[model samples]
Target: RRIATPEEVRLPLQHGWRREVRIKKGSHRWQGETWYYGPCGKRMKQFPEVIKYLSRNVVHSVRREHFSFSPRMPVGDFFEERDTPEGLQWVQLSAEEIPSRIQAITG
Candidate 1:
């Protein structure tokens, strides 16, 4: 669930996913600490991601419409049978992959 390349940060929509609106691990963690400017000078703070952090600080689905039907759909959530040293992990679904996800979840 990491955006490991500059391409990922710049062309997020081309990749068919919503880019995160903030700067995550800044100079404190990685290099290239320069600020990223968008088409209209939008200040990007953190790393790019499709994940959304709710007001409650809980990470949940970025697509609120998807949650409207299921109320508690698996969007943006993941689970594992065992706890490894790496802890739990979640799957990332791009926009193109969402259709198949809906079919799998609803069907």
Candidate 2:
């Protein structure tokens, strides 16, 4: 489940995901997503600051190994966790517009 931008994501590797993914809030570790991790073994939830910072740059390729080792495709802000009683559930985000998850990270 390597999480990367559409460009960095390979064609064969993308088979796991049917479509493009996005970023959302609750997807962070604070929301009970204990499964999420970053390239440095950091909690995925702890990555907002980094992700936000990267959003300000222009990165060509960001491998999961390069950042927090994320392999899951963010199907609309986050991975498709479970089908909730409320409806088809996913980590929530602002509108259908996805963030610049492709933004470069800082050293």
Candidate 3:
């Protein structure tokens, strides 16, 4: 279910699916991470979308209506799966990394 590119992110959204982003808050073991599910509330493993979207858009003021329906239940309050080594390695993307990441995925 991993989305490897930005175009893939647009596909689900274009078809009425939601995109989500979960950010690691600290170096600790899943303590203060933030999760933002999009207005559509549809969920798939689109890490690339999350990173790229947050890099470009605002983080707060997510509309609650979007979360009223079939949004997937998270496995934990934050990114619990990231506790494992094989889990998706959550990286902190600096503003400088945004364009590079987008280019990597889109190209």
Candidate 4:
């Protein structure tokens, strides 16, 4: 009962459940300070996912129904134990993995 305070209210609850929205650390991509934003909830109408400060004071203020059913949103796993290892990860795509060797069709 520590209260969500301005933390989650800064955005999504990101209380860290096995299934939930990804609450990122300060090293995410921002310039300064730790951040919080999470609009996803498994029990929230059965929908899940809210990130990138999906609320006010960040980019755009979200309100009721501003949430998404996670059509393309990737869900995160809080592990219910071990979380935020915060090191050694990479994007899946790079110039070497391109499938252009077949014909090379691009402008």
Point to the candidate with the largest lDDT.
3
RMSD after Cα superposition, model 3: 13.9
Each candidate: RMSD = 15.7, 12.2, 13.9, 16.0
Across residues 38-93, which tens digit of lDDT does each residue of candidate 1 receive?
33335443433112322323333222221111311222222212235896444444
Residue 96 miss distance in model 1 (angstroms)? 0.6
lDDT of 1: 0.30
Candidate 3 per-residue C-alpha lDDT over 1-107 given as tens digits, one digit per residue, 9 for 90 to 100:
33234343344344344443344324542223224454456343444555565456555543222221111222222222244667657654554544443333221
My TM-score estimates for the predictions, one after another, are 0.22, 0.21, 0.26, 0.19
Per residue, candidate 4 scores C-alpha lDDT tens digits across 54-79 of 33335533433333332112322211
* Distance from true location, Cα of 18 in model 1, Å: 12
TM-score-based ranking: 3, 1, 2, 4
lDDT of 2 by residue, 1-107 (tens): 54556454343233222222332335333122313332344433444644653465454354233333332433323333335688756654443422333221111
Candidate 2 wrongly placed segments (more than 4 Å):
1-5, 9-36, 46-48, 51-107
Candidate order (lDDT): 3, 2, 1, 4
How many residue pairs clash in each candidate at the backbone level?
A: 7, 12, 0, 2
| Alpha-carbon runs more than 4 Å astray in model 3 | 1-3, 26-107
Give the Å shift of residue 10 in candidate 1.
24
